[PDB]
Ligand binder design. Structure first.
Ligand SMILES: CN(Cc1cccc(F)c1)S(N)(=O)=O
Ligand SMILES: CN(Cc1cccc(F)c1)S(N)(=O)=O
Length: 171
């Protein structure tokens, strides 16, 4: 059976319990923690691409008020469809399964300034989603897994000083 497991789940959960935040910048900022997954049950002989996108979690935005994240207003119009292609793509099932797949180079941005960056709206919550695309498939089969442990609020600056300290402690 195809199984995609989150790596370092106990690290993501220490961010999630505070409410996780990721910085967005004009030029784009790498994530911490990095999304990494283990994969089993692909065809080792087949070729696949790995794609990453970010699904908007809410019909509203968030605000950090008195040390608490609370509903913060109506949402901005949805960020454009941005998909990140894992740079090892396309590659054999055996390649994806032999070691964890790490999205270490994806950059989150608040400006369409090119460079394969993912545009997100500040003070909106997102959930990472990985797609596995089979190459040369006339049915264009895709699989999609969501990672609820990895939800975060996009910010231009950290709101929670405990997040600022955790990012420094573990990174
Ligand atoms: C994708 N699903 C079916 C499946 C995945 C992999 C191998 C299988 F033999 C069956 S799912 N989301 O569990 O319905
Ligand atoms: C031992 N912990 C920290 C950790 C740091 C960096 C990467 C990790 F996979 C785990 S933990 N799981 O929070 O207890």
């Amino acid at each position: 059976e195809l199984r995609v497991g989150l790596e370092e789940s106990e690290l993501w959960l220490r961010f999630k319990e505070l409410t996780n935040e990721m910085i967005v910048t004009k030029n784009g900022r790498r994530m911490f923690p990095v999304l990494k997954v283990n994969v089993s049950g692909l065809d080792p002989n087949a070729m696949y691409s790995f794609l990453l996108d970010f699904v908007a979690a809410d019909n509203h935005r968030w605000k950090y008020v008195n040390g608490e994240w609370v509903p913060g207003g109506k949402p901005e119009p949805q960020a454009p469809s941005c998909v990140y292609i894992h740079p090892d793509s396309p590659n054999f099932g055996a390649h994806w399964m032999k070691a964890p797949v790490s999205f270490s180079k994806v950059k989150l941005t608040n400006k369409l300034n090119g460079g394969g960056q993912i545009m997100l709206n500040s003070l909106h919550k997102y959930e990472p989603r990985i797609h596995i695309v089979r190459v040369g498939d006339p049915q264009r089969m895709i699989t999609s897994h969501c990672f609820p442990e990895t939800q975060f609020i996009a910010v231009t600056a950290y709101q929670n000083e405990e997040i600022t300290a955790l990012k420094i402690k573990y990174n």
